[PDB]
């Protein structure tokens, strides 16, 4: 199924298209996710809606990092309340997307988000251009890693397949 | 002759590049070739340029 | 009509697993000493292994007799290119799983319908338990049954290259294993380990009891760490060989982490898509029995 | 040579696109609608297996000689004999940064190799070891502030040739016990690409082919060209009609260790990526077949057996006359 | 230079290849030389490997770096941009003829 | 010289047994070993 962009008058072409596989049992999921390697650029995330696995399919590489960041942002938040202790309504537990077959930027972008580096804020975080401003923070976090921190961030970069 | 072709030239886009190499071609004169190999070792008295 | 004294068919000289290298023939134990390894920092942690499903496939009626043994090895360590094999007479095994059956399993590696004249076969009572576990290998490519071709490999690398100091904690650092070689190497061990009589081993695992299972696992934890090494180079990402002055080393990229396509191509043994499902179904089934 | 390229060529108006062809489609032509015919698959499937069979046996001889060769070559380095001259080959060898930029740097991008590092000076006698580990080949870069005698002794049996950007003088960048190092007492020879790599299907490596290659009379580009030429005539097809229609009357592309890669938007050959590139484009296998590469393995044993080699070298002249007819 | 490093790099492509040799078969036979010391250039050695020929490869490197200067020159025209492409069918053809 | 050998002088001597430099066939030119399932050629056990 093709997803439409948020606005009604923004009649442009869609960034990505979502896909729904037939998969009942557990030993099934393991098949689609493994066969899902060696295939352009695709993404899944942690849990699922209706209990049926559904992956994302991006058009052009560039139009991946701008969606992959729009989610990593709204998940640094769900772990703000779950860190202080509060009955959170929203469901997925971990919103952060998972890069299956993917490029190279999304790697350096996947690891930086996984280990929750940000602190609080709440100053009407700019929704547009959030992509690059987050990717800039990724680099400078590395220019500080005291061996031990470096060791891990260089691993999740090199791995990038497990949440 | 066989300088610049790789062939399939004479073309419309090549037309400019074709004439540039053509107005640079030296003719295979037996004596002119020998004079280049000989000037390499022979002593001179006039400052040629 | 051989029998086991609870020493097992492996406590016999009839069939013994020996690799040929070094200009003479040697036992697996002598070989493995050459495998020296370091670390590259990607932690390969031991997961849990999910139990298999009890349902046994049906051995569709078949006249004649297939070499059940052949295929078991011809898939795992098969060297010569093996085409799709997800299909086949691969479950005639289950026809031995029931109590009173006449179908017998000979030596050499065949499955006769009726015991015939002049053919030595394993004991009809201890071949029953071997089936109620391995006939389950019939459904290896049925959707909703196949094992997972990723996590088991973590289990595999902790076996042939895991110093005990590590396994006792369940976690180890990804290793890069290099031994010293000769010519064909990796391909030569395959053409070698293929004809080994694997059935002469697996039968022992499902019968021999605690007395002669603790003693069995001690003398054979090496015949296992041999048919586990070759089965591993069919997965590794690289096979590039380092050079000394006159010496040659067969560095293997990442033992214990599973990729999807062979580093060998031409240099080593190669798997196929239909075989990736198969190796996961074997490796999963066997580990529960072993460990 | 790029695939999709607008070079000066026409396939006879098949490169010349033309509009104005839309007018017959609307007001001239008639269609079957306003019984249908379905074409047989066998007649179009036959044309494919033909134009695909002609292609394989076309470049077959070409790729073969380019495999027995390609073993390795060149890279002129000098080894500085250190010690009380108890050697003609010590091991402290080195080349220029110049020779390295046209022979070693290209092969190190076909195989995805991290670096290699820089010696620099005051570097540990295991930093060379730490690099060569993930490099697969022995090589380190340059030297600035003269290195210690601890590291200097290491790069001798481990070879690991050090590339120098300069060559004016070398005995300024080593601290030593003072024997043979004086910009002299060095013998300069040639190295091998058949030595400093030997990957799986990348570079041909075997003592059966190594011994074979060390016999020929120093080939040029013309000697090796007439080689992949005499081997052509030494060995209706709907395809023979097309083998002629084709431009077989050229084929001038030096394909030593030819590989399939994708230049960026402009012109910089990318490293073999993973997710974006397909599978087969990893290695070349010298463009030979999978089964035909395995037959080569058994044939490489016949070509080196003690009984086939019947050419003998050296004959000693003497006058012993007296006969006892001996075949030996 | 600090900023003209690219002009110095494209310029050094004129450096000679061969060694200089002190000719002896003239001074050993007492031929009159102006000099004070009999010397000369060569000017480009000979074959050293089996199938390398470094002189041919040195030229290949020139063609490689001299290609980027042409494949960068931003032209303000249209067909003069089409002549920028049909120049490599001369820049590369010529390098093959050299080997 | 003479690497292609096998055997020589297939005649028996006037009065003695072996006629000097006589070679007997190699013990390998006369051994059919069965083929393996994966690999394809090998000799006999010897023990």
8 Å CB contact between D54 and D117: no
Most D CBs within 10 Å, among C38, C184, C240, C260, to test the D interface? C240
Report phi then psi at C78, rounded to 5: -60, 130
Q: Is D246 on the interface with E (CB under 8 A)?
A: no
Spell out the long-range contacts of E72-78 with Cβ–Cβ below 8 A and sequence spacing 24 or more.
none
Q: Is D279 on the interface with A (CB under 8 A)?
A: yes
Contact E/A (≥3 CB pairs under 8 Å)? no
C39: β partners: C175
Task: Say what the alpha-carbon torsion angle C139, C143, C145, C149 is, to the nearest 10 degrees.
Answer: 100
> Is A38 in contact with D279 (Cβ distance < 8 A)?
yes
Residues of D in contact with A42 (CB under 8 A): none
The CA angle A136-A142-A144, to the nearest 5 degrees, is: 120
Residues of C in contact with F38 (CB under 8 A): 73-74, 77-80, 190-191, 194-195
Task: Give which of A124, C231, D203, D256 is closest to E60, Cα–Cα.
Answer: D256
Q: How many CB atoms lie within 10 A of CB C276?
A: 21
The half-sphere exposure of D286 on its side-chain side, counting CA atoms within 13 A, is: 26
Q: How many CB atoms lie within 10 A of CB F28?
A: 7
Task: Give which of D183, D140, D185, D180 is closest to D164, Cα–Cα.
Answer: D140
3-state secondary structure string across chain D: CCCCCCCCCCCCCCCCCCCCCHHHHHHCCCCCCCCCCCCCCHHHHHHHHHHCHHHHHHHHHHHHHHHHCCCCCCCCCEEECCCCCCCCCCCCEECECCHHHCCCCCHHHHCCCCCCCECCCCCCCCHHHHHHHHHCCCEEECCCCCECHHHHCCCCCCCCEEEECCCCCCCCCECCCCCCCCCCCEEECCCCCCCCCCCCCCCCCCHHHHHHHCCCCCCCCCCCCCHHHHHHHCCCCHHHHHHHHCCCCCCCCCCCCCCCCCECCCCCECCCCCCCCCCCCCCCHHHCCCCHHHHHHHHHHHCCCCCCCCCCCCCCCCCCCCCCCCCC
Distance from C-alpha of D60 to C-alpha of D53, rounded to nearest angstrom = 11
Conformation bin of residue A115: beta by default, left when phi > 0, alpha when psi is -120 to 50: alpha
Residue with tokens 């009999």: E38
A58 sits in which H/E element: strand A54-58
8 Å CB contact between B14 and D6: no
8 Å CB contact between A18 and A56: yes
- If you ran DSSP here, which 8-state letter would residue C6 be given? S
- If you ran DSSP here, which 8-state letter would residue C92 be given? G
Measured on CA atoms in the order C253, C258, C264, C265, is the torsion positive or negative?
Answer: negative
8 Å CB contact between C88 and C278: no
Experimental technique, in short, is cryo-EM
CB contacts < 8 Å between A and C, how many? 24
DSSP C238-265: --PPEE-SS-EE---S-BTS--SS-S-T
Distance from C-alpha of C22 to C-alpha of C182, rounded to nearest angstrom = 9
Distance from C-alpha of C257 to C-alpha of D112, rounded to nearest angstrom = 19
Distance from C-alpha of C34 to C-alpha of D172, rounded to nearest angstrom = 42
Residues of F in contact with C80 (CB under 8 A): 38
Measured on CA atoms in the order D123, D125, D128, D134, is the torsion positive or negative?
Answer: negative
Task: Give which of C289, C202, C194 is closest to C9, Cα–Cα.
Answer: C202
Q: How many CB atoms lie within 10 A of CB C207?
A: 20
> Is E90 in contact with B13 (Cβ distance < 8 A)?
no
Q: Is C186 on the interface with A (CB under 8 A)?
A: no
Q: Which of residues 133-192 of D touch A (CB under 8 A)?
A: none
Which residues of B lie closer than 8 Å to D, measured between beta carbons? Answer: 8-9, 11, 13-14
D263: β partners: D269
Residues of A in contact with C52 (CB under 8 A): none
- If you ran DSSP here, which 8-state letter would residue C230 be given? H
Q: How far is E13 from chain B (nearest CA, A)?
A: 20
Task: Say what the alpha-carbon torsion angle C50, C56, C62, C67 is, to the nearest 10 degrees.
Answer: 40
Q: Is D69 on the interface with E (CB under 8 A)?
A: yes
Binding residues of A for ATP: 108, 139, 142
> Is E43 in contact with B6 (Cβ distance < 8 A)?
no
Distance from C-alpha of A84 to C-alpha of E8, rounded to nearest angstrom = 63
DSSP E70-98: HTT---SSSHHHHTTTTTHHHHTHHHHHH
8 Å CB contact between F38 and C191: yes
Rounded alpha-carbon distances, angstroms, from residue B15 to C255, E82, E87, E88, E93: 60, 10, 11, 14, 17
Two tokens, residue D128: 């060379």
D139: β partners: D161
* Closest chain F residue by Cα to residue C71: F37
> Is A34 in contact with C149 (Cβ distance < 8 A)?
yes
Report phi then psi at E8, rounded to 5: -80, -30
8 Å CB contact between F43 and F31: yes
Distance from C-alpha of A77 to C-alpha of A122, rounded to nearest angstrom = 10
C172: β partners: C44
* Neighbour subunits, E (≥3 Cβ pairs < 8 A): B, D
Q: Is C142 on the interface with A (CB under 8 A)?
A: no
Report phi then psi at C44, rounded to 5: -100, 100
Q: Among A38, A155, A158, whose Cβ lies nearest the Cβ of C260?
A: A38
8 Å CB contact between C170 and C132: no
> Is F3 in contact with D310 (Cβ distance < 8 A)?
yes
Those residues with Cβ within 8 angstroms of residue C17's Cβ, 6 or more apart along the chain or in another chain: C27, C28, C193, C196, C197, C201, C223, C226, C227
Q: How many CB atoms lie within 10 A of CB D31?
A: 6
> Is C240 in contact with D138 (Cβ distance < 8 A)?
no
Q: Is D190 on the interface with E (CB under 8 A)?
A: yes
Rounded alpha-carbon distances, angstroms, from residue A157 to A60, A107, A151, C202, D314: 22, 5, 10, 42, 64
Those residues with Cβ within 8 angstroms of residue D80's Cβ, 6 or more apart along the chain or in another chain: D90, D92, D93, D94, D170, D171, D180, D181, D185, D186
Percent helix, strand, coil in chain C, to 5, is: 30, 10, 55
Beta-sheet pairing, A42-44 with C36-45: unpaired
Chain mean position to CA A129: 17
Distance from C-alpha of D139 to C-alpha of D102, rounded to nearest angstrom = 15
Most D CBs within 10 Å, among C266, C270, C271, C272, to test the D interface? C266
Q: How many CB atoms lie within 10 A of CB B45?
A: 5
D178: β partners: none
A43 sits in which H/E element: strand A42-44
Residues of D in contact with F4 (CB under 8 A): 307, 310
Task: Give which of D185, D174, D197 is closest to D89, Cα–Cα.
Answer: D185
8 Å CB contact between C243 and D72: no
Is A56 strand, coil or helix?
A: strand
Most D CBs within 10 Å, among C174, C181, C237, C243, to test the D interface? C243
> Is F37 in contact with C190 (Cβ distance < 8 A)?
no
Q: Is F44 on the interface with D (CB under 8 A)?
A: no
Q: How far is C185 from chain D (nearest CA, A)?
A: 12
Beta-sheet pairing, A98-99 with A42-44: antiparallel
C197: β partners: none
D206: β partners: none
Task: Say what the alpha-carbon torsion angle A18, A21, A25, A31 is, to the nearest 10 degrees.
Answer: -100
Residues of F in contact with D328 (CB under 8 A): 1-2
Rounded alpha-carbon distances, angstroms, from residue A116 to A113, A141, C162, E34: 6, 11, 33, 82
Measured on CA atoms in the order C8, C12, C15, C21, is the torsion positive or negative?
Answer: positive
Domain ranges for chain C, please list them.
1-291
DSSP C8-66: -GGGSSSS---EEETTEEE-HHHHGGG-EEEEEEEEEE----PPPP-PPPP----SS--
Rounded alpha-carbon distances, angstroms, from residue D133 to C160, C176, D5, D139: 22, 10, 41, 11
> Is E94 in contact with B21 (Cβ distance < 8 A)?
no
Distance from C-alpha of A3 to C-alpha of A15, rounded to nearest angstrom = 8
Distance from C-alpha of A163 to C-alpha of C173, rounded to nearest angstrom = 19
Q: How far is D317 from chain F (nearest CA, A)?
A: 16
C254: β partners: none
Task: Give which of C35, C32, C27 is closest to C10, Cα–Cα.
Answer: C27
Conformation bin of residue A8: beta by default, left when phi > 0, alpha when psi is -120 to 50: alpha
Chain mean position to CA C32: 16
Q: Which of residues 13-72 of E touch D (CB under 8 A)?
A: 47-54, 56-57, 60-61, 68, 71
Q: Is E85 on the interface with B (CB under 8 A)?
A: yes
* Closest chain C residue by Cα to residue A28: C144
The half-sphere exposure of D288 on its side-chain side, counting CA atoms within 13 A, is: 23
Distance from C-alpha of D299 to C-alpha of D49, rounded to nearest angstrom = 29
Those residues with Cβ within 8 angstroms of residue D106's Cβ, 6 or more apart along the chain or in another chain: none
Q: What is the CA radius of gyration of chain E?
A: 21
* Closest chain A residue by Cα to residue D279: A38
8 Å CB contact between D99 and D77: yes
Measured between its terminal Cα atoms, the distance across chain B in Å is 29
The half-sphere exposure of D164 on its side-chain side, counting CA atoms within 13 A, is: 21
Order of strands, sheet of D93-94, starting from the edge strand that comes earlier in the sequence: D93-94, D78-80, D186-188
Q: What is the CA radius of gyration of chain C?
A: 19
C290 sits in which H/E element: helix C273-290
8 Å CB contact between A19 and A54: yes
Most E CBs within 10 Å, among D221, D224, D225, to test the E interface? D221
> Is D327 in contact with F2 (Cβ distance < 8 A)?
yes
Percent helix, strand, coil in chain F, to 5, is: 0, 0, 100
- List the alpha helices (DSSP H) in chain A: 26-35, 62-84, 105-114, 130-142, 148-159
* Closest chain B residue by Cα to residue E34: B43
Those residues with Cβ within 8 angstroms of residue C2's Cβ, 6 or more apart along the chain or in another chain: C9, C14, C107, C120, C121, C122, C123
Report phi then psi at D188, rounded to 5: -95, 130
Q: Is C171 on the interface with A (CB under 8 A)?
A: no
Report phi then psi at D132, rounded to 5: -55, -25
The half-sphere exposure of C266 on its side-chain side, counting CA atoms within 13 A, is: 25
Distance from C-alpha of C74 to C-alpha of C66, rounded to nearest angstrom = 13
> Is F36 in contact with C70 (Cβ distance < 8 A)?
no
């Amino acid at each position: 199924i093709p997803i439409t962009n948020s606005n009604i008058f923004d009649d442009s072409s869609t960034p990505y298209n979502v896909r729904i596989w037939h998969a009942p049992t557990m030993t099934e999921v393991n098949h689609i996710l493994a066969l899902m390697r060696k295939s352009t650029l695709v993404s899944t995330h942690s849990s699922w809606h209706w209990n049926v696995l559904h992956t994302f399919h991006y058009r052009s590489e560039s139009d991946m990092i701008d969606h992959f960041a729009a989610k990593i942002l709204e998940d640094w938040r769900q772990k703000e309340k779950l860190d202080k202790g509060a009955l959170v309504e929203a469901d997925r537990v971990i919103q952060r997307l998972i890069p299956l077959s993917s490029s190279t930027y999304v790697q350096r972008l996947a690891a930086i988000g996984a280990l929750y580096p940000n602190e609080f804020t709440e100053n009407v975080l700019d929704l547009s251009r959030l992509s690059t401003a987050l990717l800039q923070l990724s680099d400078t976090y590395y220019q500080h890693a005291n061996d031990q921190l470096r060791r891990l961030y260089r691993r999740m970069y090199n791995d990038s397949r497990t949440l | 002759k066989r300088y610049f072709p790789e062939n399939l030239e004479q073309n419309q886009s090549a037309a400019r590049l074709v004439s540039a190499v053509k107005a640079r071609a030296s003719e295979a004169d037996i004596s002119s070739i020998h004079l280049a190999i000989a000037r390499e070792v022979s002593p001179m008295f006039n400052v040629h340029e | 009509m051989l029998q086991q004294p609870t020493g097992g068919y492996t406590t016999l000289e009839q069939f013994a697993f020996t690799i040929r290298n070094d200009g003479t023939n040697a036992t697996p134990t002598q070989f493995l000493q050459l495998l020296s390894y370091e670390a590259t920092e990607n932690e390969l942690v031991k997961k849990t292994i999910p139990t298999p499903e009890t349902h046994l496939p049906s051995a569709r009626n078949v006249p004649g007799n297939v070499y059940i043994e052949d295929a078991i090895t011809q898939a795992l360590f098969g060297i010569s290119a093996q085409n799709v094999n997800a299909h086949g007479y691969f479950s005639r095994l289950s026809a031995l799983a029931l109590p009173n059956t006449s179908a017998r399993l000979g030596l050499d590696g065949v499955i006769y319908n009726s015991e015939t004249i002049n053919i030595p076969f394993y004991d009809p009572a201890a071949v029953a338990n071997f089936a109620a576990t391995y006939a389950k290998l019939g459904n290896a490519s049925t959707p909703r049954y196949r094992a997972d071709m990723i996590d088991i490999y973590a289990h595999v690398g902790l076996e042939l290259a895991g110093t005990d100091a590590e396994r006792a904690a369940g976690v180890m650092p990804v290793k890069r294993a290099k031994f010293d070689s000769w010519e064909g190497s990796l391909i030569s061990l395959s053409r070698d380990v293929v004809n080994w009589k694997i059935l002469a081993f697996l039968i022992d695992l499902c019968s021999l009891e605690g007395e002669a299972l603790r003693a069995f696992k001690t003398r054979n934890r090496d015949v296992f760490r041999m048919m586990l090494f070759i089965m591993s180079t069919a997965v590794a990402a690289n096979v590039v060989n380092r050079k000394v002055t006159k010496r040659v080393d067969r560095v293997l990229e990442y033992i214990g982490v599973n990729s999807m396509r062979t580093a060998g191509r031409t240099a080593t043994i190669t798997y196929d898509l239909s075989r990736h499902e198969f190796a996961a179904k074997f490796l999963q089934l066997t580990f529960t029995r072993w460990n | 040579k790029p695939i999709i390229e607008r070079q000066g060529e026409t396939v006879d108006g098949l490169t010349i696109i033309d509009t104005s062809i839309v007018w017959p489609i609307l007001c001239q032509c008639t269609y079957p609608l306003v019984e249908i015919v379905y074409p047989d698959p066998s007649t179009t499937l036959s044309q494919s297996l033909s134009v695909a069979q002609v292609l394989s046996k076309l470049t077959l001889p070409d790729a073969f000689i380019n495999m027995i060769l390609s073993g390795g070559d060149s890279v002129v380095m000098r080894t500085y004999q250190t010690e009380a001259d108890d050697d003609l080959d010590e091991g402290i060898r080195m080349t220029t940064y110049d020779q390295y930029l046209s022979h070693i740097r290209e092969r190190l991008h076909i195989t995805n190799v991290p670096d290699p590092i820089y010696i620099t000076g005051a570097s540990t006698p295991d930093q060379i070891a730490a690099s060569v580990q993930a490099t697969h080949v022995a090589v380190v870069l340059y030297q600035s502030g003269v290195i210690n005698g601890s590291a200097s002794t290491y790069l001798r049996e481990n070879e690991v040739l050090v590339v120098m950007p300069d060559y004016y003088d070398v005995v300024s960048r080593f601290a030593n016990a003072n024997l043979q190092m004086n910009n002299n007492r060095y013998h300069e020879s040639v190295l091998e690409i058949a030595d400093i790599f030997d990957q799986a299907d990348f570079i041909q490596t075997s003592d059966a082919v190594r011994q074979l290659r060390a016999l020929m009379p120093t080939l040029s580009t013309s000697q090796i060209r007439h080689a992949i030429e005499r081997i052509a005539q030494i060995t209706t097809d709907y395809g023979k009609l097309t083998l002629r229609f084709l431009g077989t009357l050229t084929r001038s592309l030096k394909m030593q260790n030819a590989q399939i890669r994708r230049i960026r938007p402009d012109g910089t050959v990318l490293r073999y990526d993973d997710q974006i590139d397909i599978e087969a484009f990893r290695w070349s296998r010298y463009f030979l077949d999978e089964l035909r590469l395995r037959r080569l393995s058994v044939g490489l044993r016949l070509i080196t057996n003690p009984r086939i080699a019947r050419r003998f070298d050296g004959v000693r002249i003497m006058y012993l006359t007296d006969d006892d007819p001996d075949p030996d | 230079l600090a900023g003209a490093n690219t002009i110095i790099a494209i310029m050094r492509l004129f450096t000679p290849q061969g060694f200089l040799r002190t000719d002896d078969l003239a001074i050993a036979a007492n031929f009159p030389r102006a000099s004070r010391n009999p010397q000369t250039y060569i000017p480009y050695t000979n074959q050293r490997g089996t199938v390398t020929n470094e002189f041919a490869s040195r030229f290949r490197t020139i063609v490689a770096t001299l290609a980027n200067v042409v494949n960068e020159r931003a032209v303000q025209d249209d067909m003069q941009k089409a002549t920028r492409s049909c120049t490599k069918q001369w820049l590369r053809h010529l390098e093959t003829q050299f080997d | 010289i003479s690497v292609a050998r096998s055997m020589r002088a297939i005649v028996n001597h006037n009065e003695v047994d072996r006629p000097r430099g006589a070679v007997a066939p190699s013990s390998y030119e006369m051994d059919t070993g069965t083929l393996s399932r994966n690999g394809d050629l090998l000799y006999s056990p010897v023990a």
